């Protein structure tokens, strides 16, 4: 029975529905499930005031404000501020009850409902760890994790040290193997394999030991990219099998400890570091008290054997033939199978929802593609035309918004355009027509337009199941230019800057060179373009190789005439900046020489900033720890006081504006500074 030892079951158990139902309801020890439940509840309680935004609710949902919001459905609307505070209080109470084990099911539902309401409220706050938290809560709702180490067993002698069915562990293990597998099968994209996604991450001081035997570019290519891909692909297989459990445990622990320091992703690292002992035997907490001293073995509950439970089906050779499974067992097995199948299918569902497919497939948040695509934005321009007088005006990019993610998605752009159309008449404007002009470069590519600048987005057509028509395709046959682009960028001085631009045929770019931008020029790399000077009306044609100098403080237009896309570049110098720095350096040198035998203020304040940085470097870590603890305490206290204020207002009523001002001023006292 080698396969029976490797997998824990036999092939004959899967030959019938009855046998599978019996196998999936096998009795199991509940200790690991209890430990994971406690840790997850504690982490959620710590996370609610920080990342979910309980300490910024007054700023975000201030009553009577002109804000554009981006919900998944426009039928979903937020409530007043006090009801937001009530919803967050209910979610916090549910998380606390889930952690303690007191009223497990009610607390699970109380955490689950408002969390998903808040999640669906805004599309601009979706990431992968929030989705994972929602999924874990949904799974834990249907399990019985209060059968060990819980308050629910103290006031009920029927759920204390009882068996649990096997699928309770199978569902969680299957989930943690989809995170790591579907995350390294998405890192088999040419930009991750070639080493373009995270090129500057190897400069961290945590990678210094690797530099003793590898070069910097080799460290970036091998350790960061290929090592990460291999770990993601093989972690689940390493953890599942007991022959290689220790090595896999050490590797994933080191990986998550590194990721907790490199990035700022909330509690993702700590959550996935507590979900890896759910692959070890379900009795590890029971065995871990046998190594602690026997002096401390008396205050903990006596380690007895688990007591029978009605949740799991019992099949014994001598202990009767067995009972026919009821509805509970069949429902559990069906839930396990269907949930795992749907979780496998969902990340590859992008061929159905074609309306959410931009340059990158789908909405961000549920596909397990972390740190693969990076974006850089060069210029954003919003222009509206009055529908009555025909006047042309320009709006400040991102006026009534609280995020910046609307620049990459067509649905968010449509929502923003509709919000602006509804809000503009309040500022003495008739019905507007709004056009957008956004330049984006993805993974160190040429900058190009992502949306058509000739299309009025207010009257455009968008559907969830239809491919958008006004989205410009990514110029994929220009990536092999990146080596030459990097060489050109490196072969520069300490004062010049370079911008790379690729333009579609039939469109033109209008630019206004600032006064301080003396000595600016345009050089053509491919195709053919014509440059027109607005002041002195004349066209000039360019060929591959030549360059032309442009004046300062004047409008110039670049027209693309080649049948194929053409690319050029900009070289400009800040004459005022270099003159200021050179005169500052000359004056500082002269003053230093004189002493030893507002520009000065700027130099002195920069020196003061450098001195503060070096003093913080020299000082030990305990002051930093004290400051970090003080900031966390301040945020917790502020959230608690505002929640109490809003709860009092809801229960009794608004006392007076003066008292409200006094309590609000009290709530931001900064306890110790």
């Amino acid at each position: 029975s080698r396969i029976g030892k490797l997998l824990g079951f036999e092939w004959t158990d899967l030959s019938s529905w009855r046998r599978l139902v019996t196998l999936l309801n096998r009795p199991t020890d509940p200790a690991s499930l209890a430990v994971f439940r406690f840790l997850f509840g504690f982490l959620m309680v710590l996370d609610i005031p920080q990342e979910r935004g309980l300490s910024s609710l007054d700023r975000k949902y201030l009553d009577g404000l002109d804000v554009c919001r981006f919900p998944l459905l426009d039928a979903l609307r937020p409530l007043p501020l006090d009801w937001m505070y009530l919803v967050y209080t209910i979610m916090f109470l549910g998380a606390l009850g889930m952690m303690l084990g007191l009223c497990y099911r009610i607390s699970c539902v109380l955490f689950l409902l408002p969390y998903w309401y808040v999640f669906l409220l805004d599309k601009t706050s979706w990431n992968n760890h929030s989705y994972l938290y929602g999924l874990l809560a949904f799974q834990l709702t249907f399990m019985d994790a209060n059968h060990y180490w819980s308050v629910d067993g103290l006031l009920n002698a029927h759920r204390r040290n009882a068996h649990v069915p096997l699928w309770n562990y199978a569902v969680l293990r299957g989930q943690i193997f989809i995170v790591y597998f579907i995350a390294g099968v998405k890192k088999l994209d040419a930009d991750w394999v070639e080493g373009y996604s995270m090129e500057y991450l190897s400069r961290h001081w945590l990678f210094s030991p690797f530099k003793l035997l590898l070069s910097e570019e080799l460290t970036s290519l091998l350790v960061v990219h290929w090592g990460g891909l291999l770990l993601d692909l093989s972690a689940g297989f390493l953890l599942f099998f007991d022959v290689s459990r220790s090595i896999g445990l050490f590797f994933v622990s080191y990986f998550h400890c590194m990721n907790s320091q490199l990035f700022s992703i909330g509690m993702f690292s700590y959550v996935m570091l507590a979900s890896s002992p759910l692959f070890c035997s379900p009795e590890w907490p029971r065995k871990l008290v046998s190594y602690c001293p026997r002096r401390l073995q008396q205050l903990l509950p006596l380690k007895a054997a688990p007591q029978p439970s009605v949740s799991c089906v019992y099949k014994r050779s001598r202990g009767k033939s067995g009972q026919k499974p009821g509805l509970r067992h069949q429902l559990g097995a069906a839930f396990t199978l269907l949930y795992l199948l749907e979780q496998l299918f969902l990340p590859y569902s992008h061929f159905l929802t074609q309306g959410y497919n931009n340059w990158t497939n789908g909405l961000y948040g549920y596909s397990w593609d972390m740190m693969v695509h990076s974006r850089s934005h060069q210029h954003v321009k919003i222009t509206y035309r009055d529908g009555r007088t025909g006047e042309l005006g320009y709006l400040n990019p991102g006026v009534f918004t609280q995020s910046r993610r609307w620049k990459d998605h067509a649905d968010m752009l449509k929502q923003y355009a509709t919000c602006l159309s509804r809000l503009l008449p309040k500022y003495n404007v008739t019905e507007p027509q709004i056009y957008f002009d956004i330049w984006v470069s993805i993974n160190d590519r040429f900058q190009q337009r992502i949306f058509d600048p000739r299309v009025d987005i207010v009257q455009a057509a968008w559907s969830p199941f239809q491919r958008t028509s006004w989205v410009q395709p990514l110029l994929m046959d220009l990536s092999p230019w990146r080596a030459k682009l990097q060489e050109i960028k490196s072969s520069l001085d300490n004062h010049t800057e370079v911008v790379f631009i690729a333009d579609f045929p039939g469109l033109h770019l209008e630019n206004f060179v600032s006064e301080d931008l003396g000595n600016t020029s345009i050089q053509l790399l491919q195709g053919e373009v014509t440059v027109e000077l607005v002041a002195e009306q004349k066209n000039q044609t360019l060929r591959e190789g030549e360059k032309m100098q442009l004046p300062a403080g004047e409008y110039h237009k670049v027209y693309t005439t080649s049948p194929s896309p053409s690319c050029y570049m900009y070289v400009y110098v800040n004459t005022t900046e270099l003159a200021l720095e050179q005169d500052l350096a000359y004056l500082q040198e002269l003053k230093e020489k004189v002493e030893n035998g507002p520009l000065v203020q700027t130099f002195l304040r920069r020196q003061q900033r450098l001195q503060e940085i070096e003093r913080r470097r020299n000082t030990p870590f305990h002051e930093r720890f004290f400051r970090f603890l003080l900031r966390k305490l301040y945020v917790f206290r502020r959230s608690f006081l505002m929640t109490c204020i809003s709860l009092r207002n809801l229960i009794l009523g608004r006392p007076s504006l003066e008292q409200l001002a006094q309590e609000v001023t009290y709530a931001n006292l900064r306890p110790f500074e």
């Binding site: 990431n127 740190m371 210029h379 320009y394 709006l395 400040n396 006026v399 911008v499």
Partner: peptide, 21 residues
């Protein structure tokens, strides 16, 4: 405080990941 002019709007010559909060 939400309107620009042609001069400031047309100035072109002046990386991030969506997982970090």
């Amino acid at each position: 405080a939400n309107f620009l002019s042609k001069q400031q709007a047309s100035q072109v010559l002046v990386s991030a990941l969506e997982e970090e909060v």
